[PDB]
Design an enzyme around this catalytic site. Structure first.
Site, short mmCIF file in Angstrom:
data_model
loop_
_atom_site.label_atom_id
_atom_site.label_comp_id
_atom_site.label_asym_id
_atom_site.label_seq_id
_atom_site.Cartn_x
_atom_site.Cartn_y
_atom_site.Cartn_z
CG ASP B 92 -2.15 0.83 1.04
OD1 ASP B 92 -3.04 0.83 1.92
OD2 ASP B 92 -2.24 1.49 -0.02
CB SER B 93 0.46 4.60 -1.38
OG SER B 93 -0.76 5.05 -0.82
N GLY B 94 0.59 4.04 1.89
CA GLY B 94 0.78 4.66 3.19
C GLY B 94 -0.21 5.78 3.46
N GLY B 95 -0.79 6.33 2.40
CA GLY B 95 -1.74 7.41 2.56
C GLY B 95 -2.84 7.05 3.53
CE1 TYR B 96 -8.48 3.70 5.13
CE2 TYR B 96 -7.21 1.78 5.83
CZ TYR B 96 -8.40 2.50 5.81
OH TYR B 96 -9.52 1.99 6.44
CG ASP B 136 -4.62 6.85 -1.84
OD1 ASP B 136 -3.70 6.12 -1.44
OD2 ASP B 136 -5.82 6.65 -1.54
CD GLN B 183 -9.33 7.48 -2.50
OE1 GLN B 183 -10.26 7.63 -1.71
NE2 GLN B 183 -8.45 6.48 -2.39
CG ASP B 260 -6.43 -4.91 1.06
OD1 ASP B 260 -6.96 -4.17 0.20
OD2 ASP B 260 -6.21 -4.52 2.23
CB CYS B 298 -12.46 -26.01 6.37
SG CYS B 298 -10.85 -25.25 6.30
CB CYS B 300 -7.24 -25.44 6.53
SG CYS B 300 -7.80 -25.34 8.23
CB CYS B 303 -10.56 -28.14 9.32
SG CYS B 303 -11.19 -26.53 9.86
CG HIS B 329 -10.42 -22.26 10.04
ND1 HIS B 329 -10.88 -23.25 9.20
CD2 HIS B 329 -11.45 -21.41 10.23
CE1 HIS B 329 -12.14 -23.00 8.88
NE2 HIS B 329 -12.51 -21.89 9.49
#
Ligand SMILES: NCc1c[nH]c2nc(N)[nH]c(=O)c12
Ligand SMILES: NCc1c[nH]c2nc(N)[nH]c(=O)c12
Ligand SMILES: [Zn+2]
Ligand SMILES: [Zn+2]
EC number: 2.4.2.29
Lengths: 363, 363
Positions: B92-96, B136, B183, B260, B298, B300, B303, B329
């Site tokens: 991610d860019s870091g803006g968030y 952003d 945006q 994500d 599941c 995994c 499980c 899980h």
């Protein structure tokens, strides 16, 4: 697969090396046992515990009886199925943890809720334990001769009850093993009394209790020097709660065959990593950009993939992956140490190893 | 192995399925990205992350710049080597995170210590990131048209600087990819403006920013309905910060290709396990003796071996192994969900799956 068979394949001084065969697996001695308080070796999947080399893990009776409960675990299928470890599990009796974590001491048992030799053995049974420890009392340190002699005697009385309690459960007596625990603080005569009483009762293995309770190494070795030889020779010798690297080496020299300790596990989560050049606190600012593994020779998966810098980062950030990696490394390190100890005894060079180890470990 | 090539192999409604090929690996879309804040997907070894099915993980620029530091990671060899994940990493860019965790906002960048589009791109570069997000500003919710239009415009100005900043680093422009972020809050005209500006600048993929910021699902879908179609069609569509199971399904229906979210990871450590019959809080007293796995279907490893009772025990006891298992899980569950989504689209039955999924998940 026999119920419990100990055989010595090599010796050197008082040190011995061999195997303990049990229904759930073979245990190589001298052995180190990762501690599994709460039905889990902290931060590790059972397979990862096995991968470090452990043949057996120690489970605590005190903690499990409270949460999640013995009958409950028995109902779910036993501790092995519950946590996913199918190899031998040794379960402490609870005497040690009761008079340490929570007390109304009498002859029937202990109150903090009554825990009696009889109940202890049943609990270890419901858990499906492979090596049952006799219910006892770990004498605090220091302790006047009288006090040390009181606990010891009562312990020895509990030893007998533990034994009978164990022999009455047909399916337990036939599938598990029973160890008695010697007590008697740092007093030679008390240790001897204890040994005789235990040998008189009969046990599959003998543990040395009440040590590493604050007396320091010098004292511990001194006490071990006359105490270990009191126990029968053709049976396993278990030094309880001892695990500092240097301590294990000395104890093995003095005849100890089994060890259990939280040091590896607890020390790891806190930032201490064991290396052949002595321990290191990975949190130190000097590892921030160190691309070398925790230990230059360690064969563990952690030392094969990640750097001290990365782990340094994880620990300072309080990340769970940090504890996972540190713990896998420390237990793996302990198992490599045990492997080096077994091999050197099998080759008649344990003495030199012990010497080479201390020079470097403490250089 | 190309630098970045997206191909659609099947469609149904607005939903698409395909692959994104990059130098470090192939990414199957629709894709879910485990979040790796602090250079570690919480409580999991990279191999375990890979075992759940993840093709790519998201790394945060904000957090890493502070600790352990971009130049430092670059010096140790880059994020991939540092954490031990050799597949694609999107950063991610870091803006968030800046305007969320720590503020002096201007046109040059942001202060909390200046973080500018230029610096953001360099940081993502030093980390060795495969998909660089444009720097952003995530407009808070609500937001008057004017405000939403200010941020957006400045963002779009940053988009251009991000682009040039990215194209100047010859080895970055040649090995990584660049996504622009749309945006404009919940306003149709603003979203359109943003889209045009981005498409005008040119990007390898387009993310839909500023959603799932508190507007609720109904609103989000509504906004997604007209926004997603604005982005080019032959390029990946990335919905940022969206991960509730039901949300992913709806977004995929509306054309989203990448997701994500921390829900899986964070939710797990806290006691929530995702099942096809909806989530469950393993801490509930009703799982105390439930021998069934987290989810009956599941696949995994968790499980396959442990019971809800055991995990229930681990979580209530605050044991690290508890978080490890719950997290493996949940991420595995998310990846199975994505697999079911890709397969149903490839077979032209996504619509029915989406329907069958909601009926059961919410029954
Ligand atoms: N340090 C002594 C010790 C550790 N663990 C123990 N467990 C028991 N039952 N008795 C003991 O004396 C000890
Ligand atoms: N919920 C919106 C969101 C999540 N992550 C994000 N990252 C960036 N750069 N911008 C955004 O708008 C978002
Ligand atoms: Zn190691
Ligand atoms: Zn599962």
């Amino acid at each position: 697969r026999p119920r419990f068979s100990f055989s010595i394949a090599a010796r050197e001084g008082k040190a011995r090396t061999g195997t303990i065969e049990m229904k759930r697996g073979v245990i190589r001695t001298p052995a180190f046992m990762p501690v599994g308080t709460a039905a889990t070796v902290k931060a590790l999947k059972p397979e990862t515990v096995r991968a470090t080399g452990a043949d057996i893990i120690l489970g605590n009776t005190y903690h499990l009886m409270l949460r999640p409960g013995a009958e409950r675990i028995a109902k779910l299928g036993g501790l092995h199925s519950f946590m996913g470890w199918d190899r031998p599990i040794l379960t402490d009796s609870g005497g040690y943890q009761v008079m340490s974590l929570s007390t109304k001491q009498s002859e029937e048992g202990v109150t903090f809720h009554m825990l009696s030799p009889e109940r202890s053995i049943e609990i270890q049974h419901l858990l499906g334990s492979d090596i049952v420890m006799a219910f006892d009392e770990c004498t605090p340190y220091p302790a006047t001769p009288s006090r040390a002699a009181s606990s010891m005697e009562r312990s020895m009385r509990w030893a007998k009850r533990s034994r009978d309690a164990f022999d009455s459960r047909k399916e337990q007596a036939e599938n598990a093993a029973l160890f008695g625990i010697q007590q008697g603080s740092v007093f030679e005569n008390l240790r001897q009394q204890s040994a005789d009483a235990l040998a008189e009762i009969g046990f599959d293995g003998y543990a040395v209790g009440g040590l590493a309770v604050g007396e320091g190494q010098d004292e511990m070795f001194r006490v071990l020097d006359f105490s270990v030889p009191m126990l029968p020779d053709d049976k396993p010798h278990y030094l309880m709660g001892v695990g500092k690297p240097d301590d294990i080496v000395g104890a093995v020299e003095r005849g100890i065959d089994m060890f259990d300790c939280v040091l590896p596990t607890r020390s790891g989560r806190n930032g201490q990593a064991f290396t052949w050049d002595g321990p290191i606190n990975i949190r130190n600012a000097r590892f921030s950009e160190d691309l070398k593994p925790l230990d230059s020779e360690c064969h563990c998966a952690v030392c094969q993939k990640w750097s001290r810098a990365y782990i340094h980062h994880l620990i300072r950030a309080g990340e769970i992956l940090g504890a996972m990696l540190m713990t896998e490394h420390n237990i793996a390190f302990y198992q490599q140490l045990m492997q080096k100890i077994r091999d050197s005894i099998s080759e008649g060079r344990f003495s030199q190893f012990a010497q080479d180890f201390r020079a470097r470990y403490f250089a």
